[PDB]
C-alpha cells in the first residue's frame, strides 16, 4: 500500500498508487491548511515550464535525448488531464511556491522512469532535481509558472468572454436605438434617452476594459526563467534564459519573452498587481452593468420595470411575474470578490524582501480565480440573462411622460422661467405638465403636444 | 513673517520663524517631510497636550520637576487645549513613523512658551527644556501611542457614540410613527410580501443598536495606555508608580476610564487596539450604507421611481432640470462610508506591520482612524438632522404600489383556495390588471368580497 | 443513467445515481462560474438546520412523525459524511442562497424518501417544498445556516487553535524570562529587553484577540429563521422562532437565539462583518508575530539569528543551515487572504437592499474561509514552528553587546552628557563604548565593567 | 466678518459673509454638510476654473456669450488659478456626489467676481449670472467629471510623471556606480548566493521604469472629458461643436492632449478612468514599499541588524537614547504606500456604484484620487533628495558578511569536488566557523589556494 521515498532528510512513506515523492509528501504532513490547492491553470502552466526546460536542456546537450523525451511525454500527460490526483499541496505553503515545484518535479521523475521501462520510487531512471529541475531553481520556476498560466487565461478565457459580451450588448444597443426613455441621475427623474444610449454606456465601458486589460500582457509575459536562485543565472548556459522563453512561445502560441530584468522579475509580483488592476476595473464595470440590469428589471409591479429579463429558476405557481435577478447576483458577488482579491494580491506584491518575493502561492491563487470569475461570470451573465434583455415598451413610455423635466422642451418656445413655473407647478400640486401648462395659459393644448416631444430630445 | 530665530539640537543649529514657537526638531521635520497636505488632527494636537500635561503633574508628584517648571508647562498645555495654538503644529502625517516629530513639536512648543510664562523667552535662552523638562520620564515611542489611544477614545465617546444614539433615537420615534403603514416587501429588488413601513425601520433601529454593542466593546482595549513603557516597554529607569500615576492622571482630566497597559510590549510594537475599534466601525459604514440607500431608493422619483416616502429638500443644484432636488445627505453618507471602508484597508496594513519592539506606521493609522471616527460622527449627525427627522410616508403611493401588485393574492386563499387564487394571480401578471380586476373577470368572487378579505393589515403578524 | 424530475419549469434529467432534483439540476445549467463550492461546514450548518425545522415542524403538529424521523435521519448522513458529493452547486448562485437551499431540501426529500421504503424521484414519498422546507424561506433558512456555521467553526477550530498558540508562547515567554537581548525599534539598535518580555508582546496580543472575538459571539449566535419571507413570519406558529433557535441550541450544544429583529436579520450580514472585523485584528497579529520569528531566525550568518526553529523541509547538502521559515510563509500569506477577504465581506454587507441581503454566498465563503486558514493555520504554525522556538544564546549575547544605547548605563554615574559624548564617539570612529570611554578618561574599565549591566536594564 | 450680504437662489434667501464672493448655493452646502475636515483640493478648484475657462470661450466663439461678459468670467478664473481666491471655496468632499455644490460654488464666486470686473457689484444685482452666464451649456454632470479628468491628468503629467523619473535616475546612477560590489543574496530572509549591489538596485530601477509604463497607459482614458454629454449624455440643445471645440480649448490652455469622450454615457455613469489609472498608481505603492523596506533593511543598525549600506542621517529625536537616527524617509514612504492601497478600495467602492446615467460617488473619488498622486509625486520627491541620492556602501560590513557566510562555498566544487565541497560546508555550520577555517582544518586545501578560487565577482554573472 505504501513505498518508501528519500531525500536528504530521510526516508518517509508514500503512497504506493501515486507518483509524488518524499518532498510532496512531507509538505502533506506540514501544510494542512483550509482545502484551496493549486489550480489546474497553474498545474498546466507548471507542466509546460518543465516541458521546454526539458527540451532546452537537450538541445544544449545537458540533458540525455531519452530523457528529455520522456519528461515531456509525462507533461503532456497532465496537461492531458491524466494526473489531476497527483497535485495534492495547499496554496498555504512555502512562499516561494517550491513544494510545488518540488511536487512537479517528482510526479514527472516517477512517470518518466515508468516510460522509459523502470519504475517509480528510489529505484526511478529519471531524477526529479538532477534530471526534471536541470539549469531550474524554485525561485524562478515558480513565477514563471505563475505569468505562463496568467497571460493564457486572459488570453483563451477572460477575453474571449469579454468580447463576446460586448457584442451581445453593442446589439442590444443598435436594436433598441429609437426607445425613448427617462434618465434618472441620483436615482430622480431626469431627461429623456434612448435605451439604446444608455445600453451602449455599458459597451464603452467593457470596450474600455479590454484596451485596459490588453494594456496589460506585455510585462505578464516576461519571465523569470534563467535567473535561478537570486537573478543572477549563476552555473547556467547563457543562452538558456532566451532559449526557454522561446520555447514557451512555440509550445503556448504565445508571446513569451525573457524577462529583461531578472532582479525585479524575482523580487516581486508586479506584473500580477498591475494587471488585476484592471481586472478590478472590469470588477467595477460589470458591478455597474449588472446593478443597472437588476434594477431596471425590477418589479413586476413595484419598482422599475422598464425591461424583462429571462427566467431561468421555477419560482411558486401563486407567485407568477416574481423574477429574481439571478445571474445579476452572482455576478455583483464575485464583483465583490476580486476587489477583496486585488487587496490580497497588493498586500503580497508590496512584501517582497531583498532578492526573492516569497507571497506567491497566494498572489497567484487570486489572481487565477479572478480570471476564472470574470470569464466565467461574463459567460454565464451573457448566455443567461444578456442575450435575454428585451424592452417592455408600454411601462417604458408610462414613466417616459410622467418626467416633470420633459418642461425643457418648452425652453424655446415660452422661456425658461415659466417653464420652470410649469415644472414648480405640477409638484407643487398633484398635476400633470400639461394640467399645470393650461391652468397657466402658457400655451393651448395643442401646442403643448406638438412642441414636447420626446424623440426630439435625445440629440 | 520673514525674521529668524536660531533653534538648536544635537545635529545643529537651524533658522525657525521668529513669531512661532516650536524648535529645531519640528523645523527640520517640517522641511524634510513636504509630502502631501494632511496634518496631525487637532484632536490628536490635544492628546499630546493632555499626555505632557499628565506627565508633568506626575513627575512633579514624584519630585523629579520643580513646581514652577510643572505647572508653567500645564498653563502652556491648558493653552493649547483651548484653542490659542493651533498654528504652532505644522507637521505633516508622512514624517517618521514613530511620530517622534509631533511628540517633538509638542516638547518644544510647550518648552518656550512656558519659558516665557515663567517670565523668560523663548529660543536657546529658554528656562524650560523640551527634552529635560517637557519630555521627562517620556520616549516618543510611548508618548505617541498614548496620544493616540486618548484622541480615539475621546472621539469615540464624545462625538460618535452620542450620534449615533441621536440619529437611533430618531429612527425609532420613525418606526412607532409608522407601525401601521403597511407596504410592499422587496428582496432580490422584486415585489414581495408586505410589512409596515415601522417594521423596516425597525430594521434600521436595531441595525444601529447593534452597532453601538459592538463600539462599545471596542473601548476597553482602546483605554489601555503606553505611557510608562518608554523605549522598548521596559519602562528602563521610570518611578515603578509612574505608569499607573500616569493613567490615573489622564483619566482625571479627561474624565475617561484610561488605565496603563497591562502588557507595555503589545502596547508599543501594536497598533491592535485601533485595528479592532476601527472594524466595529466599519461594521457601522456597511450598516449606514444599507440605511441610506433604503432611504434615497424608498424617496426615488417623484415620479419615475418608487416614491414611498419623502425628505426633506435642502438646496436646487443649477438651473439645468428645474426643480429637481437630489437626496444628497444620503450621498454624503454613501461617500463617506466607502471612504471608512479603504481607511480600514490602510489601518490592518499598517497594524500588520510592526517590527520587533515598535510598530512604526503610527502617523498613517491614527489620520484614517481618527478620520473614520470624524465621518461616522458627524455624517450620522447631519444626516439625523437634515434627512432622517423629517422621513415622512407617501400614504397614497404607498397604498397605490400595494394594491396593484400581485402580492396580496394569499389573502384569497382561505376564501377561494389556492388552486383559483393562483390562477387570479396569473392572469393578472399576463394580461397586465390589478388582482381585482382578474378575480372579477374570472366570477370568483364580488368586489365586496375582494375589499373584506384582502386586508393588508392582518398579513404583518403584529 | 438519468431520471426525469420536474419543477414548475417543466421536466429536466437527473443523474440517477445521484439525490437531488430538479433545482439543483437547473442551477448546474445556469451557475458555472469558477469551482469554489459550499464548504462542508455550511452544508453540515444548512443539514443542521433543516434537521431542527422538521423537529419542530412535528412539536407544532404541522409534520408527521415518520416523515420527521426520516429528514432527520438523512440529515444525520450528510452530517456523518454520507452524502459530499450530492452538493454540487457554486458559491455564485442566486444571492440569497436559495439554490443551496432548494439543493438540501431535494437531497433531504429524494433520501427520506428511501428511508421510509420509497423511491428517488418524482414518486418520492417525501417533498422537498412541502415538507423538507415547511414553514421556511430561503430567505431565512440561508442566514439561519450561515450563522450555525460561523458560530460553531469559532467555537471548535478558531478560539481552541488560538488558546493552544497562546499557551504554547506563553511556555516559551517564562522559559526565556532571563535572556538579555537587545531592543530593535525603528529596525535600529535599542536598549535591552529579555526574550521573555519579547515574546510576552506576542502572548498579550493573542489573548486580547480572544477576547475581541469573544465579544463577537453573541450577534452571530442569533438566527433569523422564522422570519420567513421578509421579517414578520407571516402564515408560521407563533412559537416556531423560539422552538426552532432552541432546538439548534440543543442538537448543537451552542448558544443559539432567535434574533430579536428579524428584518435586521434577513436585510443584513452585519453579525458576520463585525466578527470579521476581529478576524482580520488576528490576522494583524499573527502577521507580526511570524515576520518577527522569520526576521529573528534569520541566517544563519547574514541577517539577525537570535532564534533558531525547526527545520521542515530537505536541503541541499552543500547548502546546511539554510532553513527558511516556511511556516512563517504560510501564515503571512493567509493573513493577506484574511485582509482581502475582509473587503469582500464588506462590500456584500454594505449592499443589502430593502427586505433581504442577496450577497450571501459569498460572504460565508469568504467568512468560512478566512475561519479555516486561521485556525488550521495557528494549528500549523504551533505543531511545526512555535513548539520548536529557540534561542542562539552566544549570537543573542554578541549582539546584545554590541549596541552603542548600552551606554544608556552610565547616566547615573557620569552623567547624559558625557554618556552621549561616549555613544557619539564609538559611532564616529570605529570603536566600542568602552575603548571610547577610557580613551576620554571619563571612567576606567572596572567601573564600565561594574556599570554596564544589560541584566539590570530591563526592568 | 459678522456683516452679511443676502443671497438668493431658486428656494429662496440666505446670508452670506459679505467679505466672500460665493453665493446662495455655496452657503446652504457649508451649512448643510458639516461632514469632518477634508475640502476640495486646490487643484480640483483649479480644474474647475479651467473648465469653466474654457466653456466661457467656447460660449463667446459660438455667439452664444457677450465678449464683455465672456472675458470677464476668463479674467475672474485667471485669478482664481493665479491664487487670489482659495478663502473663496469652503465646501467639504462629503457633499452631494455629483459635487453640484462645488460647481455651483465655481459658478458663483466666477459670476460676483465678473460683475465686480465689469463695474458692477457682488449679490443679487450682479451683472452677470452664475446660472444663466457661467454656467451656461453645461450641467454639474458633465463640469464636475471633467474637473476630475483635467486635475488628474494634470497631475500625473506634471508632478507624478517626473518625480517618477527623477528617483529612477537616481537609482541607475547608484546601480552603475555599486556595479561592482558583491554582496550576499537573501532569499526567505536566508543567506543565498551572490549577486552585485548595483545588481541589487538595478531591480529596483527596473520596477520603476515598469510602473512608468503602466502609469503612461492609464492616460489616454484620463484625457477623455465628459463636457458636452450634459445633464444625462445626449448633449441635449447644445451646439454640435460645442463637446469638441470645449476639449480643443482645455488642451490648448493646458497644454496637455485632452479630448472629448467618445461615449458621454460612459463618462458620466462611471469613473472608470480613474479606476484603472488608481489600479496603476496602487501598483506604484508596492513597487515603493518593497525598495523603501530594502533600504531601512539594508541600513539597519548600526550594529545589531544587517548594516550593508549607509543613508543620510537628517534628523535626532527625543535625547533618550543618544545619537540614535532612524531611516525616517523610507517610513514616511511606507505609510503612504499603505495609504494608497486603501485609497484604491475607496475608489473601487465608489466606481462600482454607479447608477443609471451618474455616478454620484465622485468627491470621494477624487480626493483620494488626487491624494495618492500628491502622496506618491511628494513622497517620490523626498525620498530621493532625502535619502536615495546618498546611499553609500559599508565596503567592509558587506565583504565581512560575504565572508562569513556559507554561501560561497560551491566556489571549491570544480577545485575539491561536490563531496568535500559540502563536507566544509557542513563543518563550518555545525562548528560555527568559516569556510576557509573548516576547510583548513580538515587539511583539503591551503590557504592561498582559498583566496584563489573562491573569488566572488566571479559568482554573479556579468
Not at 531519452?66 to 496554496?91: C, M, N, T, W, Y
Not at 464575485?334 to 498586500?347: E, H
Amino acid at each position: 500500500t505504501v513505498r518508501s521515498e528519500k531525500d536528504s532528510m530521510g526516508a518517509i512513506d508514500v503512497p504506493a498508487d501515486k507518483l509524488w515523492g518524499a518532498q510532496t509528501q512531507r509538505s502533506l504532513e506540514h501544510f494542512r491548511i483550509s482545502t484551496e490547492k493549486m489550480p489546474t491553470s497553474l498545474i498546466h502552466a507548471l507542466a509546460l515550464t518543465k516541458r521546454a526546460a526539458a527540451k532546452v536542456n537537450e538541445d544544449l546537450g545537458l540533458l540525455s535525448e531519452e530523457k528529455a523525451s520522456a519528461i515531456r511525454q509525462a507533461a503532456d500527460e497532465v496537461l492531458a488531464g491524466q494526473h489531476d490526483d497527483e497535485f495534492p499541496l495547499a496554496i498555504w505553503q512555502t512562499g516561494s511556491g517550491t513544494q510545488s515545484n518540488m511536487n512537479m518535479n517528482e510526479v514527472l521523475a516517477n512517470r518518466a522512469s515508468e516510460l522509459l521501462g523502470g519504475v517509480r520510487g528510489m529505484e526511478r531512471k529519471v531524477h526529479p532535481n538532477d534530471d526534471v529541475n536541470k539549469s531550474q531553481s524554485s525561485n524562478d520556476v515558480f513565477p514563471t509558472a505563475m505569468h505562463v498560466a496568467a497571460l493564457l487565461a486572459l488570453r483563451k478565457q477572460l477575453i474571449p468572454q469579454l468580447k463576446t459580451l460586448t457584442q451581445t450588448l453593442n446589439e442590444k444597443s443598435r436594436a433598441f436605438a429609437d426607445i425613448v426613455k427617462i434618465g434618472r441621475t441620483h436615482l430622480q427623474d431626469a431627461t429623456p434617452l434612448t435605451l439604446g444610449q444608455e445600453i451602449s454606456g455599458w459597451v464603452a465601458m467593457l470596450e474600455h476594459n479590454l484596451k485596459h486589460i490588453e494594456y496589460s500582457l506585455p510585462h505578464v509575459a516576461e519571465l523569470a526563467l534563467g535567473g535561478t536562485a537570486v537573478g543572477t543565472g549563476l552555473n547556467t548556459h547563457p543562452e538558456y534564459a532566451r532559449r526557454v522563453a522561446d520555447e514557451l512561445a512555440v509550445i503556448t502560441c504565445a508571446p513569451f519573452v525573457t524577462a529583461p530584468n531578472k532582479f525585479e522579475a524575482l523580487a516581486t509580483c508586479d506584473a500580477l498587481v498591475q494587471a488585476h488592476g484592471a481586472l478590478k476595473g472590469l470588477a467595477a464595470s460589470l458591478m455597474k452593468i449588472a446593478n443597472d440590469v437588476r434594477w431596471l428589471a425590477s418589479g413586476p409591479r413595484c419598482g422599475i420595470g422598464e425591461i424583462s429579463i429571462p427566467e431561468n429558476e421555477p419560482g411558486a405557481s401563486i407567485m407568477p411575474g416574481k423574477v429574481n435577478p439571478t445571474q445579476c447576483e452572482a455576478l455583483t458577488m464575485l464583483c465583490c470578490q476580486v476587489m477583496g482579491n486585488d487587496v490580497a494580491i497588493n498586500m503580497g506584491g508590496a512584501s517582497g524582501n531583498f532578492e526573492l518575493n516569497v507571497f506567491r502561492p497566494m498572489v497567484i491563487h487570486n489572481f487565477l480565480q479572478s480570471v476564472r470569475l470574470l470569464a466565467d461570470g461574463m459567460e454565464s451573465f451573457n448566455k443567461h440573462c444578456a442575450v435575454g434583455i428585451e424592452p417592455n415598451r408600454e411601462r417604458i413610455n408610462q414613466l417616459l411622460n410622467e418626467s416633470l423635466m420633459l418642461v425643457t422642451a418648452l425652453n424655446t418656445h415660452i422661456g425658461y422661467d415659466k417653464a420652470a413655473e410649469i415644472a414648480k407647478k405640477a409638484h407643487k400640486e398633484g398635476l400633470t405638465l400639461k394640467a399645470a401648462a393650461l391652468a397657466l395659459g402658457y400655451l393651448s393644448e395643442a401646442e403643448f403636444d406638438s412642441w414636447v416631444r420626446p424623440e426630439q430630445m435625445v440629440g
